[PDB]
Design a protein around this ligand. Structure first.
Ligand SMILES: [Ca+2]
Ligand SMILES: [Mg+2]
Lengths: 155, 801, 144
């Protein structure tokens, strides 16, 4: 909650960029409020963003930087799924219990359950993470969870 | 999967293919409905105790009390085989599971120890030999619910444990318990057959007993007007060695009175069918039913009853049973005479307050078939001869008194006759081979409450009362042995609890029935006499005994007092009890018949070397003493509607039965303890989501961690050695707490991905910015340049080379 | 640069229509009309306080060299556009670039937009940023 002038700087760095990508004018479109937060390392939920000011579509509300701090500070207090959290979840769709699951079910979970992801988005994350589905048509979710968590740029 | 299972199991597939909805344990619930008993609803808003909802069906809105709302089970518990596994176990949840399975053609459904059976009102392919081969020796859980399983397991329990078995079948009139009892037998006979046949007799005994104990009622076209306890004896090799029968509360009032659209026992119409003209004379009857007043009161015919065929078969049934010609005919003779009894009329007032006869025709015929003197009969029937000590007297009879003594005679004669019949059948089925063990099948009317309840209903409810107590006790022992078996033993008391107060209030020393019997041996005993005495002993002393309250349904009839039975407080009217208890019967007429010349008649009225209530209570104690020394089994027959229409369910009716059935009381009984239980293995698989950050990655361990983690209320649960116990509705909470989290966790994983993508496009955005920046800066220069007055001239001055 | 400064002299070798080694306030309007157009008697006094000393092609290159200042190279610009073409097709979709310029960064107004795309090289919906780059710079031919 209380932010480090470091964190705020970083916050200004990212707020700078986004303000630019929709017309430089010290204002950022709410439909990006969440996207700005993500570039900072936070993983807000569609609900968390809508609860702090975020909007549904573009061109409805723009926010000054002075209104991003409060908003960002809020999103920092939301829950962040841990490894166990995710694993037990997937584990529930695992019959046998040997860490596998059908790609269909995977895409099913991701686009049908919870605040659904667009098929275009799921299509995009399997490519970046490179979750290869073996011979029969199932994947090792344990690995897919680590990569989504490990992030685009590894170590 | 398999032809024989068409009306047993539905489709695991077609039930997984139930997708016209997810389910919100937060919004979906049941609500009271006048037409469908209960109704599916979607909560809307709440203002304290006033919940507002929408009915999925008509989509309207009604306001109900939060306390009247009942939990609704998720779609995964649709048409469940054993409702003792349903996350939410209640009135509505049970009614729905029954309705659903029934409308799908399934009629057998478990509910713990119970095996509920709804009358299909249409024959089904479920009872074939082929089907039988499938249930042989299979445990109840490893196969679709079926009556054959209650029977089979009973048999295999008898062999395995070496102990008597008892199968109690109850239910209202028309519920199909009789046909169920038969089925049970056909089964035991087809899995333990010797090596006509013994089995044949057990089978032929039906015709004759049905001829005397069954009649047509608005509820059933062939209703057993008597309770029957049938015991099946086996040998050391598990084969049927023999059997015997015991009857209870035969409805004698029928012998001389029928309600509209009802008949008297089938036998009377068979003897007047003219199927065996050669007997018309030995009985002195004319082949016309509407001719005799003891049987032409209600209706005379029945659609599915061929009174002419049935009589022929009955005749044969006797033969196959070994009855002697002299016996069979004696039976017919005694029967025919009752017809003539109702045909005797009397002349009243010559110049006296005492009656006289009006012809003999009728009294002569009766005398003939009964082997006595008609002058004697009528002289005793008219002015009696009592037995006053040291100097017996003569009494004067009335117009009323005499006609009511004839009906008494018929009623009393029929009963004796029927008891002799059952005893005779027994005599046949008793192949002297003093067996090893047995398995008895009970078949009596169930607990039923009406608009007007009388001495008859008391006897019924009083019996089931003792019977229900027998269940609670069984359930009690079962529960104890389970808890102790899981090291989680506990307090307890016993389920045969509030049941004893009511029972004692009826069968004990200064209780109801006792007062009824005491108050009979007195001549000048009034209705308000019995009342006065009744009130004095228990009114204001007994909680289970109170005064009439606010009528519950339309048309409640009079009532003198209320009795708190386990099924509810039943208003009884003691009007007539005195007369209905004792059978006023010409002590004189009896003597004459005692000296009758017909062997059957003589034996029927032979004196020693009485009251209904004292007889039943004695034969009930025997029954119970027997039952408590057997291993119980329960079959709850239920009637879906008053139209005999298949697939039609009437909520207000099924619910009523469930209330008195024993299922609802069996659920409340099990609520005290810890109902729903899961074996640790399952618990972790299902609820690890509720505490991922506390899981190491044993079995009870994980569970003990999940529960402790959830800050579980110590009372709510308990820890067995193989499985964990939970209070009613607890798992339900754990269920919802499971949906919210799994959902949030998925959402959270979905967000982490959204966060992954963007961060990945970040570097590109940082670059594309300076890029676009360049473009815009530059494109603006060339645009300014080409607009600078010096350039157009500086460069339009270019065109040479 | 090297030869523009030399071609200036040789193109400032016409701007000398009265040939004095100096040009002049009137002198321009005689080198203009002699082709059309005609910058007013005042489109020169705000356009004459432009020489950090008298004028005459060596004091002309310190006026052309200085509002011309602030540009980037051809590779720099065609590498800028080459940041929105991952497939490396050497072309950007028309609506895409228009959108980039008009609603992102330092937005263009309907005017700058109209002026930029008048002579923009667009074939079948594709914008040739490589060709367009040459235009703006001069390597090819520029038009208004
Ligand atoms: Ca902006
Ligand atoms: Mg000059």
């Amino acid at each position: 909650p209380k932010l480090s002038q470091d964190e705020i700087d970083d916050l200004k760095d990212v707020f700078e960029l986004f303000d630019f990508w929709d017309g430089r004018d010290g204002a950022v479109d709410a439909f990006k409020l969440g996207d700005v937060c993500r570039c900072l390392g936070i993983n807000p939920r569609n609900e968390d963003v809508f609860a702090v000011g975020g909007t549904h579509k573009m061109g409805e509300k723009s926010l000054p930087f002075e209104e991003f701090l409060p908003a960002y500070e809020g999103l920092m207090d939301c829950e962040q799924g841990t490894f166990a959290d995710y694993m037990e979840a997937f584990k529930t769709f695992d019959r046998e219990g040997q860490g596998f699951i059908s790609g269909a079910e995977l895409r099913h979970v991701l686009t049908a359950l919870g605040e659904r992801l667009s098929d275009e988005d799921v299509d995009e994350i399997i490519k970046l993470t490179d979750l290869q589905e073996d011979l029969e048509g199932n994947v090792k979710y344990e690995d897919f969870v680590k990569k989504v968590m490990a992030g685009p740029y590894p170590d | 999967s398999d032809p024989d299972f068409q009306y047993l199991a539905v489709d695991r597939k077609k039930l997984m293919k139930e997708q016209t909805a997810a389910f919100d344990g937060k919004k979906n619930c049941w609500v009271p409905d006048e037409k469908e008993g209960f109704a599916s609803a979607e909560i809307q808003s709440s203002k304290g105790d006033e919940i507002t909802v929408k009915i999925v069906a008509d989509s309207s809105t009604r306001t109900v009390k939060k306390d009247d709302i009942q939990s609704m089970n998720p779609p995964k518990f649709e048409k469940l085989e054993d409702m003792a596994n349903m996350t939410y176990l209640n009135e509505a949840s049970v009614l729905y599971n029954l309705r659903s399975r029934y409308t799908s053609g399934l009629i057998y459904t478990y509910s713990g120890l119970f095996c509920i059976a709804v009358n299909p009102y249409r024959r089904l392919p479920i009872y074939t030999d082929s089907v039988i081969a499938k249930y042989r020796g299979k445990r109840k859980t490893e196969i679709p619910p079926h009556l054959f399983s209650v029977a089979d397991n009973a048999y295999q329990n008898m062999v395995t444990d070496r102990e008597n078995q008892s199968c109690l079948i109850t239910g209202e009139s028309g519920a199909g318990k009789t046909e169920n009892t038969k089925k049970v037998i056909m089964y035991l006979a087809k899995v333990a057959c010797a090596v006509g046949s013994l089995e044949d007799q057990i089978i032929q005994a039906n015709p004759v007993l049905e001829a005397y104990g069954n009649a047509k009622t608005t509820r059933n076209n062939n209703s057993s007007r008597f309770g029957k306890f049938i015991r099946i004896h086996f040998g050391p090799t598990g084969k049927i060695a023999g059997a015997d029968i015991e009857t209870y509360l035969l409805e004698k009032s029928r012998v001389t009175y029928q309600q509209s659209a009802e008949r008297n026992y089938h036998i009377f119409y068979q003897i007047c069918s003219n199927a065996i003209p050669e007997l018309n004379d030995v009985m002195l009857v004319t082949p016309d039913s509407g001719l005799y007043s003891f049987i032409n009161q209600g209706c005379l015919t029945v659609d599915n009853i061929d009174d002419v065929e049935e009589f022929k078969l009955c005749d044969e049934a006797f033969d196959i049973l070994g009855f002697t010609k002299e016996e069979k005919q004696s039976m017919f003779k005694c029967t025919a005479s009752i017809l003539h009894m109702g045909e005797m009329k009397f002349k009243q007032r010559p110049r006296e307050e005492q009656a006289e006869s009006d012809g003999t025709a009728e009294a002569e015929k009766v005398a003939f078939l009964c082997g006595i003197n008609a002058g004697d009969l009528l002289k005793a029937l008219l002015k009696p001869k009592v037995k006053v000590g040291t100097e017996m007297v003569t009494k004067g009879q009335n117009m009323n008194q005499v006609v009511n003594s004839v009906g008494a005679l018929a009623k009393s004669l029929y009963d004796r006759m029927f008891n002799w019949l059952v005893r005779r059948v027994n005599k046949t089925l008793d192949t002297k081979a003093k067996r090893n063990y047995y398995i008895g099948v009970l078949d009596i009317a169930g607990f039923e409450i009406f608009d007007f309840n009388s001495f008859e209903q008391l006897c019924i409810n009083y019996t089931n009362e003792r019977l229900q107590q027998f269940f609670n006790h069984h359930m009690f022992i079962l529960e104890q042995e389970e808890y102790k078996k899981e090291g989680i033993a506990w307090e307890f008391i016993d389920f045969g609890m509030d049941l004893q107060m009511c029972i004692d209030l009826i069968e004990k020393p200064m209780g109801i029935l006792s007062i009824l019997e005491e108050e009979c041996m007195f001549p000048k005993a009034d209705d308000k006499s019995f009342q006065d005495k009744l009130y004095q002993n228990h009114m204001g002393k007994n909680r289970m005994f109170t005064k009439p309250g606010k009528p519950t349904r339309p048309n409640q009839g009079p009532a003198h007092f209320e009795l708190h039975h386990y099924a509810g407080n039943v208003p009884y009217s003691i009007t007539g009890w005195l007369e209905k208890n004792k059978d006023p019967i010409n002590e004189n007429v009896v003597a004459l018949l005692g000296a009758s010349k017909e062997p059957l008649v003589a034996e029927l009225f032979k004196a020693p070397e009485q009251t209904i209530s004292a007889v039943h209570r004695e034969s009930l104690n025997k029954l119970m003493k027997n039952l408590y020394s057997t291993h119980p089994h329960f079959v709850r027959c239920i009637i879906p509607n008053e139209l005999k229409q298949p697939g039609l369910v009437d909520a207000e009716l099924v619910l009523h039965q469930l209330q008195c059935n024993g299922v609802l009381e069996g659920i409340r009984i099990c609520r005290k303890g810890f109902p729903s239980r899961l074996i640790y293995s399952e618990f972790k698989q299902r609820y690890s989501i509720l505490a991922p950050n506390a899981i190491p990655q044993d079995g009870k361990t994980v569970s003990e961690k999940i529960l402790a983690g959830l800050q579980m209320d110590p009372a709510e649960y308990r820890l067995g050695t193989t499985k964990v116990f939970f209070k009613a509705g607890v798992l339900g909470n754990l269920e919802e707490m499971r949906d919210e989290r799994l959902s949030k966790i998925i959402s959270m994983f979905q967000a982490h991905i959204r966060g992954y993508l963007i961060r990945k496009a970040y570097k590109k955005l940082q670059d594309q910015r300076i890029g676009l920046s360049v473009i815009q800066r530059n494109i603006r220069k060339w645009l300014v340049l080409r607009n600078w007055q010096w350039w157009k001239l500086y460069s339009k001055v270019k065109p040479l080379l | 640069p090297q030869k523009q400064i030399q071609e200036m002299k040789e193109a400032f070798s016409m701007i000398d229509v009265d040939r004095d080694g100096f040009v002049s306030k009137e002198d321009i309007k005689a080198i203009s009309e002699q082709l059309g157009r005609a910058p007013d008697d005042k489109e020169l006094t705000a356009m004459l306080k432009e020489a950090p000393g008298p004028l005459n092609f060596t004091m002309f290159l310190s006026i052309f060299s200085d509002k011309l200042s602030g540009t980037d190279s051809e590779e720099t610009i065609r590498n800028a556009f080459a940041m929105f073409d991952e497939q490396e097709t050497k072309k950007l979709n028309i609506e895409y670039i228009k959108d980039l310029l008009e609603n992102m960064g330092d937005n263009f107004n309907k005017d700058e937009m109209r002026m930029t795309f008048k002579e923009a090289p667009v074939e079948g919906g594709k914008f040739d940023y490589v060709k367009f780059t040459a235009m703006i710079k001069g390597s090819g031919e520029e038009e208004a």
